[PDB]
Amino acid sequence: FSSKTEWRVRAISAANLHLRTNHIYVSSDDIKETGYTYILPKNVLKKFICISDLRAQIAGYLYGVSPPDNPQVKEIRCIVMVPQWGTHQTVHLPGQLPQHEYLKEMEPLGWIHTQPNESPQLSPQDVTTHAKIMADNPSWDGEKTIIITCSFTPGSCTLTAYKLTPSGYEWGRQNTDKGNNPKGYLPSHYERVQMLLSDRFLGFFMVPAQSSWNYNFMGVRHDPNMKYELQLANPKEFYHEVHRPSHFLNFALLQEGEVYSADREDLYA
Amino acid sequence: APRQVLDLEDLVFTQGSHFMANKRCQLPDGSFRRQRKGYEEVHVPALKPKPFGSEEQLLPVEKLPKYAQAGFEGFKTLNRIQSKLYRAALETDENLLLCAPTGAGKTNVALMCMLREIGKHINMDGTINVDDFKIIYIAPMRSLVQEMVGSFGKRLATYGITVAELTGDHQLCKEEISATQIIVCTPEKWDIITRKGGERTYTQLVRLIILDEIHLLHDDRGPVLEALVARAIRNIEMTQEDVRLIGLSATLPNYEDVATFLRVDPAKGLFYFDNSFRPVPLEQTYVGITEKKAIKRFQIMNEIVYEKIMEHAGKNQVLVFVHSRKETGKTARAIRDMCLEKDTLGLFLREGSASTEVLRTEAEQCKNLELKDLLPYGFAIHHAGMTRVDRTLVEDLFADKHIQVLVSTATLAWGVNLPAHTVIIKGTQVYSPEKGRWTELGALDILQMLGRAGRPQYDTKGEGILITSHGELQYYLSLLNQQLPIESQMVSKLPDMLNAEIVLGNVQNAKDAVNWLGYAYLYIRMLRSPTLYGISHDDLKGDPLLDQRRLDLVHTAALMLDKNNLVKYDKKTGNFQVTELGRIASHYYITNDTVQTYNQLLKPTLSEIELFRVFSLSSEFKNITVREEEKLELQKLLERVPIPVKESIEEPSAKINVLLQAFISQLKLEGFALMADMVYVTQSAGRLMRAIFEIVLNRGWAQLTDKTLNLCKMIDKRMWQSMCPLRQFRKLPEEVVKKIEKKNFPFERLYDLNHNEIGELIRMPKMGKTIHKYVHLFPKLELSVHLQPITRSTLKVELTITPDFQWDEKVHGSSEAFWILVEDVDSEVILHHEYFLLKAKYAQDEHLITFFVPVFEPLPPQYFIRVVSDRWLSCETQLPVSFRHLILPEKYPPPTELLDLQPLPVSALRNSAFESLYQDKFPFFNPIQTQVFNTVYNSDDNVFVGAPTGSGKTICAEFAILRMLLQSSEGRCVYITPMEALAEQVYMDWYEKFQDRLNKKVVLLTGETSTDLKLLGKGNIIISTPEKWDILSRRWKQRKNVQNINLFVVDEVHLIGGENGPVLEVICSRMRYISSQIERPIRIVALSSSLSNAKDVAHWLGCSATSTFNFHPNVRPVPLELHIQGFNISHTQTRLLSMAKPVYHAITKHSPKKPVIVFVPSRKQTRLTAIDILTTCAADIQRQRFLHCTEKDLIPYLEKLSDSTLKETLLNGVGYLHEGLSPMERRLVEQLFSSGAIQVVVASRSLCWGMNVAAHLVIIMDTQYYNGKIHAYVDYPIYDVLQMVGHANRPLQDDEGRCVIMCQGSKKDFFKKFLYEPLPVESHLDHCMHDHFNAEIVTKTIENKQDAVDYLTWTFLYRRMTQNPNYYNLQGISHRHLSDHLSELVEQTLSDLEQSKCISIEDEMDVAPLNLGMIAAYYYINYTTIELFSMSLNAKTKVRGLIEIISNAAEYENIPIRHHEDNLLRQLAQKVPHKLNNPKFNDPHVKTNLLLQAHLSRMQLSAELQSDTEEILSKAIRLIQACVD
């Protein structure tokens, strides 16, 4: 980013993200039928789209349970936002997975992220990210956890859901190179999975304890090994004042400017 | 006749206060016109003082009354005019008007008018006791207000009376200015503050208002003064309580018109003095310039300045008023460089080289301003901008005459007072950002600055020189000699004025509107000069009173307000209705075009980017435009702003936006035009942004109310949030702040660090302590929440706010304001919000707020409870409330349908003797009764009947009683009600119903065990309250009279829900246990209001579902119309006061001719509200409308009265009922009401239960009440409210019954939900538990832990626990869940009971009562009480100790604390035999100690606390005996 002009164009843009919110598409494609099927409550989806930005990827972590007596469907009941920052093609979020009390009741279902340009494939950066989570986390089950990619289409939003195949998981555990075309990448690595939106139940948010989630505007304050706690509260928007301290901390001024126009007229209170 | 719409545009006066209504002017005597090239110059000489009249002398400060003389020190004699009117000043309440020239010293006249009132309240042994009166001084200018409070303070300080400026934001300083008298303010301030109601707590304590410089009537600001005074007068006509009004004006014609306006009797009240009375005679010079081209003009005026100034260059003094900031010093240095260009001519401003102190001007050398250049020479400059102290240092220099040339601004004339030998006004034109252009300065500005001409002391006569444009030259003559009419600009503002009056409720309809306008200055002007105001004389003759013009006028205002949605007013009725938009508009003094712009523009989804634009579109800014020259700088500013404007290009929107940002971002601007503009924008911005916040918050749209309150704060504080909060403490160094901003270390992480750890971050350790202070000065709340589900739809939230910050009144001041708002799952919708205000006293005291919130069908992961300071920026705390574990209650089955039955005649029961006690009362039983009948009467089984209060369940009980009557001669029946009042109320009926007609003996239980025992068993029907029937019947095993009862009746069982409910629950349960052991069935009949969970109650009390009748509140014999009225004023006094008028209106609307009961929060409030009902009764022009008999008939009743005011209120048909009234007085009032003599009775809330007289309309006023113990208000218990509502029932006659409940904003939704639906009821036994286990263990009903659990299973708690487990903090609905829960329960109850030595627990299994518990159980005393006794009473204790030990008893904490009982009990405690060790006077134990000693000393107290004393004494002996034991 240009860090001056580049900030503002996208900033007055993102104030319209809520317009997208009511036009969304969902990939319908061939159902494995032996697979799990994930239901995403619409409210969290709306809010998640609304906090995002149209260039930097933001990501969120999925937490849910399967409804009683129906083990093959996973309701996503919660999204957790952790300290993070994006690129246009990927997202850097820390090594620690969410730990918190409200979360103990549910299982992790993977993660969801915004995708500035729509691609009909799981980006190598993603399969690599996911495998590398999975390597370090037994908590995440290969077969149960997914990557939901939410892409910004014109005036719209459109989303797909992927699972790593074991081929993919091994490649990704192995993979170093984060470029858009790493060696040995294959369409054999991922698999699409069945997902539905729902108005039947409401999902909720988990959000960083002492800060907010969006570190894009401080990259030096973000570290892979950084630790965080959580709370029950909603995410602030991308360009929200808090995510942007450096800019509100731009004041170089001498007080005596106030000497000029010392006619104080007030008369009201 | 029907009204017609007119155009208010061509009907106003543009360029107001420059108006010049007369087109002809006059010479003075020796005046001449001499025209030069390019400029006409007019000269008038000084006036000739009127020769002293025969035997007319000045008054010294001696010969005027003794008291007032104080504070006049330094002044030996009164001014001629002061001396003229002092008599009427101090000897009459007649209103005043004086017209006297500038310099006559008008203030000291008005001062006397104040010293009279200050004297009206005086005592011998104390002076000027200050809570009787307050005075309001309205002055036109701010500087003038400041300086006036400054000197008034000094002067009046001898009296010790506290006078202050009213700059207060409404809420933080009200309770501050509560203690303030003689408050000074600008008319505007008074108008907003009255529109909000900050005044309505002050008024009626106001006997005097001063209008100073009332000629401001002619200014655009005029309508405000017109609005003030009109309101004051129109109000006095309603209240009949009068006020003095003292007007002060410059000398101008239309004096008699202003007189009419102020209701000044021209005879004794009018005072006029012409321009000859100016203390320093004024020679007037006026030079108008004919030059059209401005380029040549800006030379000509320079040169006129030079010649005029060189004229006085000898021994004399000149003062130049320029209207520019910078040009104060641009005008100087022109004179200087000219004097240098003069070949050193004009110089030597002294008597010599060294003479006249040139070393004075040289030795003062180094100064803050540009003075260093000018000071070595003869002249200098003055203004507010460049310096603070050096202004005072220049004023000192001018007074002592070391500078004979001073160029300055109007704020110098309006500020601290110094004159000049001759003053010169350069140009008269100023820049008006409000008007968007340049315009000639106001009347008061010149009048003030030219009234500075000449000294009172060092001068002979003053001169003044006004350099203006020739075209305005006529105008400025019509002023400074009295030619100018004072006219009203009121028409321009008429739509805005009307709104605010509807908003205050002072105008309901068109008629009240014309009545109001009939009090305006514009009215008398339209009367006496119709020709000017747009009325031809012929149609004036056609309508002499202007009824049809005042009807046409205001009709257009009504239409404008309707079209912008400020008011809903239909032409047919002529009535107005206020909308919240209207209120917001009035409260912020924002125009009605701006507000509709906001209505259409504002949507939930608005970004900051857009919020600013909407702000920029405010109609208040309509004339602001963007100039070519400044579009160069605006672009730079546009790229240096944080919030993108880029939606807009260069147009007014952009200019205003970038300006607001510039101000917040704190940016200095090169152009002067832009500076003034920016100032305008930002000053109006506070009110504007705030009205936005209020609107958008009332809508409930969370995100935008955040963005808008934050904007408000950013405007107030002049910074963005991205800057360190420490900046709001201005006490802090800038470099330190910038330093902590340098390193990014999130602010809330400063609390973890100590004084040293702080300084280590910025490597400035010397600061380490001071920083720390501020970090802990910054307001911080921590908050906890206790949440329990009520119904599947609603949860209850108890928020506990604990102050985490150190209070300093030099920072936080008297009060700190916080919004608490609970937001939904996405932080999208605001489900609920309250305004919470923590006062000074109560920092560190945790406050408890209780409120309900709804839940919805996709049950969400959590809500959020947000709390944010109003004024404080970056100060917020959020609290996730997680539902992850929430278990919602089982949805409630539909109420049993009301069957359609042939209404049962009394002829049903074949018993004639029974028929007799009904037939002559009502012909038919109601559908409820007739549906219950066969089950309750012809059949023997337990029934439950819920129906909402007013359904007639009492005779449903009487059915069962009659059945038992047939069953056996001696048949025994016990009847229970939770309210003792209700019990006596039942007894009075049933004693005649049964004992009188049916010969069957009827009794009513009492305190004493013995007498009570004897009572039952002689009686067939035993009426009692749960506590009386607990103590007796705990021992039931031994008392055969308990066991042998045939029937058992529980009335109002839903009351289980409330406190003193557990005892009810426990006695019904016990009753069942007895029927278990007695082997005979004991029929139980329970009666409740509509109950959602009635099933549980029935299952508990053993009713088959077939005999269970639970009815919906919509089933009532007489239908009810319920209305709820929300009031947004949180401060309870103001709220309670502002619902006064609505009460009257609620009567006139809902029940004009029918009986009306009004319930009130306070014992005393009943009087006051009866009064107010009568005083606003006069308003209607309708007097004594509520009295239905002649005064001759009421005399026999009034002979029995003590209370004198009650006589009055009764005389007009009202009357009241409360604690203090003698039972005869009460009986009388009740009689008068029911008989139909008086149509309205105001009653204390306490009397809702025990009142035997019903009504048609019931109005509940303000559902909160005051509790001294936590020092806060607390809501009416819901069942109470339902009872008050049920008090509107009149089945005999009315086809309907009506209720209006006026309550706070917060409490609105709660009533909307729970008054209509059937009610849920939960058990409280889990909390109040020990006492009963103890007592029961004593009877050996619980022999061991097992028996304890078993006992638990007989309760209603047992029933409910699995129904709504989250309420009882039971975490699962399972079997072992409930089992483990009850287990843990008896476990800890028995443990706590064993710790207290009331029982002994053997083997861990068995239990036995011990000494303590035995005592407790015997005397029916709380167990903690006698434990306290156990650790308190020692070997050496005596009556001194026994008093306090017996006082701390638990049964004495039921004793409450009333409004300001902290001083009362202190005054009593002073004079009692035994003093106390640092007693807190809000504590009921202390109060009972003091009341007890008072009783021992036979001191007669007020009946208020005497009642209390009696109640203490009632239960005293038992406690005493327990101590003996």
Coordinates of C-alpha atoms in Angstrom, one line a residue, chain B residues 928-1200:
Chain B
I928 CA -65.1 -16.5 35.8
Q929 CA -67.2 -17.2 38.8
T930 CA -69.9 -19.1 36.8
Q931 CA -67.2 -21.3 35.2
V932 CA -65.5 -22.1 38.5
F933 CA -68.8 -22.5 40.4
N934 CA -69.7 -26.2 39.9
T935 CA -66.1 -27.2 40.7
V936 CA -65.7 -25.0 43.7
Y937 CA -69.2 -25.3 45.2
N938 CA -70.8 -28.5 44.2
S939 CA -67.5 -30.4 44.4
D940 CA -65.0 -31.2 47.2
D941 CA -61.7 -31.1 45.4
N942 CA -58.8 -28.6 45.5
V943 CA -59.1 -25.9 42.9
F944 CA -56.8 -23.2 41.6
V945 CA -58.3 -20.0 40.2
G946 CA -56.0 -17.5 38.5
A947 CA -57.7 -14.4 37.1
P948 CA -56.2 -10.9 36.9
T949 CA -57.0 -8.7 39.9
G950 CA -60.5 -7.4 39.6
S951 CA -62.0 -10.7 38.5
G952 CA -64.0 -11.5 41.7
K953 CA -62.1 -14.5 43.0
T954 CA -63.0 -13.5 46.6
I955 CA -66.5 -14.8 46.2
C956 CA -64.9 -17.8 44.5
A957 CA -63.4 -18.5 47.9
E958 CA -66.7 -17.7 49.5
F959 CA -68.2 -20.5 47.4
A960 CA -65.9 -23.0 49.0
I961 CA -66.6 -21.5 52.4
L962 CA -70.4 -21.9 51.8
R963 CA -69.9 -25.5 50.8
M964 CA -68.0 -26.2 54.1
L965 CA -70.8 -24.4 55.8
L966 CA -73.3 -27.0 54.5
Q967 CA -70.7 -29.7 55.3
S968 CA -70.7 -29.1 59.1
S969 CA -72.2 -26.8 61.7
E970 CA -68.8 -26.3 63.5
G971 CA -66.8 -26.6 60.2
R972 CA -63.5 -24.9 60.5
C973 CA -61.8 -22.7 57.8
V974 CA -58.5 -20.8 57.6
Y975 CA -58.0 -18.0 55.1
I976 CA -54.7 -16.4 54.1
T977 CA -53.6 -13.2 52.3
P978 CA -50.0 -12.0 52.1
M979 CA -50.9 -8.4 52.8
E980 CA -52.1 -7.4 56.3
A981 CA -54.0 -4.5 54.9
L982 CA -55.8 -6.7 52.5
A983 CA -56.4 -9.0 55.4
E984 CA -58.3 -6.4 57.5
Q985 CA -60.0 -5.5 54.2
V986 CA -61.3 -9.1 53.9
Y987 CA -62.2 -9.3 57.6
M988 CA -64.5 -6.3 57.5
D989 CA -66.4 -7.9 54.7
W990 CA -66.5 -11.4 55.9
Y991 CA -67.6 -10.4 59.4
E992 CA -70.8 -9.0 58.1
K993 CA -71.2 -11.6 55.3
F994 CA -70.9 -14.5 57.8
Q995 CA -71.1 -13.5 61.5
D996 CA -73.8 -10.9 61.0
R997 CA -76.1 -12.8 58.6
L998 CA -75.1 -16.4 59.0
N999 CA -74.4 -16.3 62.8
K1000 CA -71.1 -18.1 62.2
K1001 CA -68.2 -16.6 64.3
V1002 CA -65.4 -14.9 62.3
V1003 CA -62.0 -14.0 63.5
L1004 CA -58.8 -12.1 62.5
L1005 CA -55.4 -13.3 63.8
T1006 CA -53.0 -11.0 65.5
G1007 CA -49.4 -10.9 66.9
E1008 CA -49.7 -12.8 70.2
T1009 CA -49.5 -16.6 70.3
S1010 CA -51.9 -17.1 73.2
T1011 CA -54.7 -14.7 72.1
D1012 CA -54.4 -16.1 68.5
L1013 CA -54.7 -19.6 69.7
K1014 CA -57.8 -18.8 71.7
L1015 CA -59.1 -16.9 68.6
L1016 CA -59.2 -19.9 66.3
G1017 CA -61.4 -22.9 67.3
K1018 CA -64.0 -20.5 68.5
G1019 CA -64.2 -19.2 65.0
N1020 CA -65.5 -20.9 61.8
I1021 CA -63.5 -18.6 59.6
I1022 CA -60.0 -17.6 60.6
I1023 CA -58.4 -14.7 58.6
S1024 CA -54.7 -14.4 58.8
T1025 CA -51.4 -13.3 57.3
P1026 CA -48.6 -15.8 56.6
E1027 CA -46.3 -14.8 59.5
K1028 CA -49.1 -15.1 62.1
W1029 CA -50.0 -18.6 60.7
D1030 CA -46.3 -19.7 60.6
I1031 CA -45.3 -19.2 64.2
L1032 CA -48.6 -20.8 65.2
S1033 CA -48.8 -24.0 63.1
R1034 CA -45.1 -24.6 63.2
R1035 CA -45.8 -26.5 66.4
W1036 CA -48.9 -28.0 64.8
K1037 CA -48.3 -31.5 66.1
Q1038 CA -49.3 -30.3 69.6
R1039 CA -52.1 -28.0 68.6
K1040 CA -55.3 -29.9 67.7
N1041 CA -56.9 -26.7 66.5
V1042 CA -54.5 -26.5 63.6
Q1043 CA -55.1 -30.1 62.5
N1044 CA -58.9 -30.2 62.5
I1045 CA -59.5 -27.5 59.9
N1046 CA -61.9 -28.3 57.0
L1047 CA -60.9 -25.7 54.4
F1048 CA -57.7 -23.8 53.7
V1049 CA -57.6 -20.8 51.4
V1050 CA -54.6 -19.0 49.9
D1051 CA -55.5 -15.7 48.3
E1052 CA -53.0 -13.9 46.0
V1053 CA -50.6 -16.9 45.9
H1054 CA -48.6 -15.4 43.1
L1055 CA -47.3 -13.2 45.8
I1056 CA -45.0 -16.2 46.5
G1057 CA -42.8 -14.5 43.9
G1058 CA -42.3 -11.4 46.1
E1059 CA -40.4 -11.1 49.4
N1060 CA -42.1 -12.4 52.5
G1061 CA -43.1 -15.0 49.9
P1062 CA -41.1 -17.9 51.3
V1063 CA -43.2 -17.8 54.5
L1064 CA -46.3 -18.1 52.4
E1065 CA -44.8 -21.0 50.4
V1066 CA -43.7 -22.7 53.6
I1067 CA -47.1 -22.5 55.2
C1068 CA -49.0 -23.9 52.2
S1069 CA -46.5 -26.6 51.9
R1070 CA -46.8 -27.4 55.6
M1071 CA -50.5 -27.4 55.3
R1072 CA -50.2 -30.2 52.7
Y1073 CA -47.9 -32.2 55.0
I1074 CA -50.5 -32.0 57.7
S1075 CA -53.2 -33.2 55.4
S1076 CA -50.8 -36.0 54.6
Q1077 CA -50.5 -37.1 58.2
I1078 CA -54.0 -36.3 59.5
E1079 CA -55.4 -39.1 57.2
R1080 CA -58.3 -36.8 56.5
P1081 CA -58.2 -34.6 53.4
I1082 CA -58.0 -30.8 54.0
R1083 CA -59.4 -29.0 50.9
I1084 CA -57.0 -26.4 49.6
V1085 CA -58.3 -23.6 47.4
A1086 CA -55.7 -21.2 46.0
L1087 CA -56.4 -17.9 44.3
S1088 CA -53.9 -16.1 42.1
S1089 CA -53.7 -13.4 39.5
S1090 CA -53.1 -14.6 35.9
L1091 CA -50.2 -17.0 36.1
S1092 CA -48.2 -18.3 33.1
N1093 CA -46.8 -21.2 35.2
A1094 CA -50.1 -21.9 37.0
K1095 CA -49.6 -25.6 36.2
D1096 CA -46.7 -25.8 38.6
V1097 CA -48.6 -24.0 41.4
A1098 CA -51.5 -26.4 40.9
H1099 CA -49.3 -29.5 40.8
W1100 CA -47.7 -28.3 44.1
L1101 CA -51.0 -27.6 45.8
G1102 CA -52.5 -30.8 44.5
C1103 CA -55.1 -29.6 42.0
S1104 CA -56.0 -31.9 39.1
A1105 CA -55.7 -30.1 35.8
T1106 CA -59.4 -30.5 35.3
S1107 CA -60.1 -28.4 38.4
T1108 CA -57.4 -25.8 37.4
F1109 CA -58.7 -22.6 36.0
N1110 CA -55.9 -20.2 34.9
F1111 CA -57.3 -17.2 32.9
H1112 CA -55.7 -14.7 30.7
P1113 CA -55.5 -11.0 31.8
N1114 CA -57.8 -10.2 28.8
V1115 CA -60.6 -12.1 30.7
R1116 CA -61.9 -9.5 33.1
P1117 CA -65.5 -8.7 34.1
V1118 CA -64.9 -5.1 33.1
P1119 CA -62.5 -4.6 30.1
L1120 CA -59.4 -2.5 30.8
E1121 CA -57.7 0.1 28.5
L1122 CA -54.1 0.4 29.5
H1123 CA -51.8 3.1 28.3
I1124 CA -48.1 3.6 29.1
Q1125 CA -46.4 7.0 29.0
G1126 CA -42.6 7.2 28.6
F1127 CA -40.7 10.1 29.9
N1128 CA -37.0 10.6 28.9
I1129 CA -36.0 12.6 31.9
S1130 CA -33.9 10.4 34.3
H1131 CA -33.5 12.9 37.1
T1132 CA -36.5 12.1 39.2
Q1133 CA -37.5 15.5 40.4
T1134 CA -37.6 16.9 36.9
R1135 CA -39.4 13.9 35.6
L1136 CA -42.0 13.9 38.4
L1137 CA -42.6 17.6 37.9
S1138 CA -42.9 17.4 34.1
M1139 CA -45.6 14.8 34.4
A1140 CA -47.8 17.2 36.3
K1141 CA -49.6 18.6 33.3
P1142 CA -50.0 15.2 31.6
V1143 CA -51.9 14.1 34.7
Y1144 CA -54.6 16.7 34.2
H1145 CA -54.7 16.0 30.5
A1146 CA -55.0 12.2 31.1
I1147 CA -58.1 13.0 33.2
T1148 CA -59.7 15.4 30.6
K1149 CA -59.0 12.8 28.0
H1150 CA -59.7 9.3 29.3
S1151 CA -62.1 10.1 32.2
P1152 CA -63.4 13.6 32.2
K1153 CA -66.6 13.1 34.2
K1154 CA -65.8 9.9 36.1
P1155 CA -64.0 9.0 39.3
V1156 CA -60.2 9.1 39.2
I1157 CA -57.4 7.8 41.5
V1158 CA -53.8 9.0 41.2
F1159 CA -51.0 7.0 42.9
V1160 CA -47.8 8.8 43.8
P1161 CA -44.2 7.9 44.9
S1162 CA -44.2 10.0 48.1
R1163 CA -46.2 10.6 51.3
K1164 CA -46.0 14.3 50.7
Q1165 CA -46.2 14.2 46.9
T1166 CA -49.9 13.5 47.4
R1167 CA -50.6 17.1 48.7
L1168 CA -48.5 18.7 46.0
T1169 CA -50.1 16.8 43.2
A1170 CA -53.6 17.6 44.4
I1171 CA -52.5 21.3 44.5
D1172 CA -51.0 21.1 41.0
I1173 CA -54.2 19.4 39.7
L1174 CA -56.1 22.4 41.1
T1175 CA -53.7 25.1 39.8
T1176 CA -53.7 23.7 36.2
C1177 CA -57.4 23.2 36.7
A1178 CA -57.7 27.1 36.6
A1179 CA -55.8 27.2 33.3
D1180 CA -58.6 25.4 31.5
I1181 CA -60.7 28.5 32.5
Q1182 CA -62.7 25.6 34.2
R1183 CA -62.7 26.0 38.1
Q1184 CA -63.9 23.3 40.5
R1185 CA -64.9 20.9 37.8
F1186 CA -64.2 17.9 40.1
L1187 CA -66.7 18.9 42.7
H1188 CA -70.2 17.5 42.1
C1189 CA -72.0 19.1 45.1
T1190 CA -72.3 22.6 46.4
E1191 CA -70.0 24.0 49.1
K1192 CA -72.8 24.0 51.7
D1193 CA -73.0 20.2 51.6
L1194 CA -69.3 19.6 52.3
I1195 CA -69.3 21.7 55.5
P1196 CA -70.5 18.9 57.8
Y1197 CA -67.5 16.8 56.5
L1198 CA -64.9 19.6 56.7
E1199 CA -65.6 20.3 60.4
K1200 CA -63.7 17.1 61.3

